[model samples]
Target: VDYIVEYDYDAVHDDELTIRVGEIIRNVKKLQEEGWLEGELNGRRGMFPDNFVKEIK
Candidate 1:
């Protein structure tokens, strides 16, 4: 599924990815926990907090 970044995120861990507001993310997979999603952006793959984005309907 696709998602849109609703807020800017500055990655603090190696597994996390940075994203800016309004950026689109593709193929996002929800993680086991409630706050994270794994996806690809700009050719890079990583996890980000779910609160920062909204599913692109």
Candidate 2:
């Protein structure tokens, strides 16, 4: 699944990925129903906010 969002959702950490609404977080590979999808973005894997990003499919 792919999600999108850019911000210090909690605490700004290296593990957290930063991208604008248009950038699209696709490196993430997981089911997003549970929220907080774990993903990677350019040597970066991070936790995604469920509400912040709607599932692509």
Candidate 3:
């Protein structure tokens, strides 16, 4: 699925994805940690809190 970043996020961990509002993320999926998702951004793959994005429909 695809998701849109609804807010800005500064990655606190190396494994997390830093995102900006209005950015589109493709192939989004939940992580094992819960309340989180992982995907690629221009080939930069990383995880992020689910609260930062909304699934694009």
Candidate 4:
């Protein structure tokens, strides 16, 4: 199983807040629609997939 990595971006650090939120929402919705948002791991990040996280409900 794979998981999509998402982060809570800081408002100040994130200039395109609306865009990022829309992107994340789109990704999550797509993944959920495909029934791949609740697994051990759906995707990988960092050097060698070190940072893995389950999708939010």
* TM-score per candidate: 0.94, 0.55, 0.92, 0.18
Candidate 2, residues 1-57: lDDT per residue as tens digits?
665664435527765556555556666765545766777555666766656665565
Leading candidate by lDDT: 1
- In model 4, the Cα lDDT at residue 7 comes to 40
Off by over 4 Å in 2: 6-11, 27-35
lDDT of 1 by residue, 5-53 (tens): 9999989998999999999999999899789999999999999999999
If both were scored by lDDT, which would come out higher, candidate 1 or candidate 3?
A: 1
Candidate 2: C-alpha RMSD to true structure equals 3.6
Worst 10 residues of 4 by lDDT: 41-50
lDDT of all predictions: 0.95, 0.60, 0.91, 0.27
Model 3: lDDT to the true structure: 0.91
Candidate 4 local Cα displacement, residue 21, angstroms = 9.4
Task: Give the per-residue lDDT digits (tens) of candidate 4, residues 1-57.
Answer: 333344432223321121122222223222323322322212422121112233445
Clashing residue pair totals per candidate (backbone < 3 A): 0, 2, 0, 7
Q: Rank all candidate structures by their TM-score, best first, as comma-separated numbers.
A: 1, 3, 2, 4
